[PDB]
């Protein structure tokens, strides 16, 4: 019940930005650097400078990225299953991690643990200080793993597959402690509440369209709402108890949710391709969205704390 | 707030090479009439879905 601008305050040209549901190629670091994968290249923008850096190319295709906790290093996955880590200050590739035998669509950090999920059906836990490509392997999906989010505060991982299943794991553990398989479609968009430990948001794809909120560790679906379009990405507000979902078929919007009541506060329009790529600014004020319409849009949605 | 393990140029070349062979080995068979693997990229015109 508060005012929220209906037009982005910045629009960047993002040529070659993928229009593939399973990718999420846009990440805003804790050091305020936006990382974006455009086709075979990765670009960085300093939000403070407006500076643009072009690190790394590949003959392959870039397929996932995730900033390290501290924002000093960027993790990068490829269509051929390769995962690499970049020292952003040095602009050099710090290390080259094997293990996957097919594209790595999603990555997630828990301090020194990097975790990758692939279209082989595997998730891999990797000690990033260690010389080993990986220390634990998890095969609990029967199709592509396309969502992966660490809690860090809670020591909890969520995974979401093209098999419509969601798993929750306690730390680095091989077996999930919980399985939610209600969704009728791919689960790529998921988010943990930073305001309340053990609360997980999950969103379904075309045939499902549902936003569900789970109280993990009590095992209760607190909420379940037909969002009326394919959910492609997701972000929990840091500065407010609100959720932003981004949409595919057949409504290319972002919708801003209240959470207390599970009601839409606002619907943000403009994209002419599915809003596949999404990320929240480090100060929590801004959400950037991206689509195969080759634009990145900056939405001022929240206040200071 | 910790020390990332850093590869020598040689170490990378090993890793890359092994990966490429592991990867090119695992030619797994598929069903070209099954669109699951790519279902979320089919627009409803292509799903052409349920009624009349």
Curated annotation (Swiss-Prot), chain A:
Domain of life: Eukaryota
Protein name: APC/C activator protein CDH1
Function as written in the Swiss-Prot or TrEMBL entry: Activator protein that regulates the ubiquitin ligase activity and substrate specificity of the anaphase promoting complex/cyclosome (APC/C). During telophase and in the subsequent G1 phase of the cell cycle, recognizes and binds proteins containing a destruction box (D-box) and an additional degradation signal termed the KEN box including ASE1, CDC20, the B-type cyclins CLB2 and CLB3, the polo-like kinase CDC5 and HSL1, and recruits them in a C-box-dependent manner to the APC/C for ubiquitination and subsequent proteolysis.
Compartments reported by the entry: Cytoplasm; Nucleus
Gene assigned in the entry: CDH1
Gene Ontology molecular function terms on file: anaphase-promoting complex binding; cyclin binding; ubiquitin ligase activator activity
Free-text description of this protein's post-translational modifications in UniProt: Phosphorylated at multiple sites by CDC28, probably in its CLB5 bound form, in S, G2 and M phase of the cell cycle, thereby blocking the association of CDH1 to the APC/C and promoting nuclear export of CDH1 by MSN5. Dephosphorylated and activated by CDC14 in late anaphase, which may be necessary for PSE1-dependent nuclear localization.
Full-sequence portion shown in this chain: 244 to 548 of 566
A single GO BP: positive regulation of ubiquitin-dependent protein catabolic process
From Swiss-Prot, chain B:
Cystine connections: none
Coiled coil stretches, renumbered: none
Induction notes from the record: Expressed very quickly after G1 release, just prior to initiation of DNA replication.
Function: Negative regulator of GDH1, the activator protein that regulates the ubiquitin ligase activity and substrate specificity of the anaphase promoting complex/cyclosome (APC/C), and which is required for exit from mitosis, cytokinesis and formation of prereplicative complexes in G1.
Subunit-structure text: Interacts with CDH1, BMH1 and BMH2.
Note: Present with 688 molecules/cell in log phase SD medium.
The protein, known as: APC/C-CDH1 modulator 1
Species this protein is from: Saccharomyces cerevisiae (strain ATCC 204508 / S288c) (Baker's yeast)
């Amino acid at each position: 019940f508060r005012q929220i601008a209906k037009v982005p305050y910045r629009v960047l040209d993002a040529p070659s930005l993928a229009d593939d549901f399973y990718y999420s190629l846009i990440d805003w670091s804790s050091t305020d650097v936006l990382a974006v994968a455009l086709g075979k290249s990765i670009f960085l923008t300093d939000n403070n400078t407006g500076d643009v850096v072009h690190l790394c190319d590949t003959e392959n295709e870039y397929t996932s990225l995730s900033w390290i906790g501290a924002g000093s290093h960027l993790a990068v996955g490829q269509a051929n299953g390769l995962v690499e880590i970049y020292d952003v200050m040095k602009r050099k590739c710090i290390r080259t991690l094997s293990g996957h035998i097919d594209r790595v669509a999603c990555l997630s950090w828990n301090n020194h643990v990097l975790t990758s999920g692939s279209r082989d059906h595997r998730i891999l836990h990797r000690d990033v200080r260690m010389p080993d490509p990986f220390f634990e392997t998890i095969e609990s999906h029967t199709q592509e793993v396309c969502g992966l989010k660490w809690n860090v505060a809670d020591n909890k991982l969520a995974s979401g597959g093209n098999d419509n299943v969601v798993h929750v794991y306690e730390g680095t553990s091989k077996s999930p402690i919980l399985t939610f398989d209600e969704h009728k479609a791919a689960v790529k968009a998921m988010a943990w509440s930073p305001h309340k430990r053990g609360v997980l948001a999950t969103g379904g794809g075309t045939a499902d369209r549902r936003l569900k909120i789970w109280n993990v560790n009590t095992s209760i679906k607190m909420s379940d709402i037909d969002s009326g379009s394919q959910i492609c990405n997701m972000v929990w507000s840091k500065n407010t108890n609100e959720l932003v979902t981004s949409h595919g078929y057949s409504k290319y919007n972002l919708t801003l949710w209240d959470c207390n009541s599970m009601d839409p506060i606002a619907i943000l329009k403009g994209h002419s391709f599915r809003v596949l790529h999404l990320t929240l600014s480090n100060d929590g004020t801004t959400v950037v969205s991206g689509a195969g319409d080759e634009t990145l849009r900056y939405w001022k949605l929240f206040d200071k704390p | 707030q910790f020390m990332l393990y850093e590869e020598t140029a040689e170490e990378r070349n090993i890793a890359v090479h092994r990966h490429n062979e592991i990867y090119n080995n695992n030619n797994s068979v598929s069903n070209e009439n099954n669109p699951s693997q790519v279902k979320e990229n089919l627009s409803p015109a292509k799903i052409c879905p349920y009624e009349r």
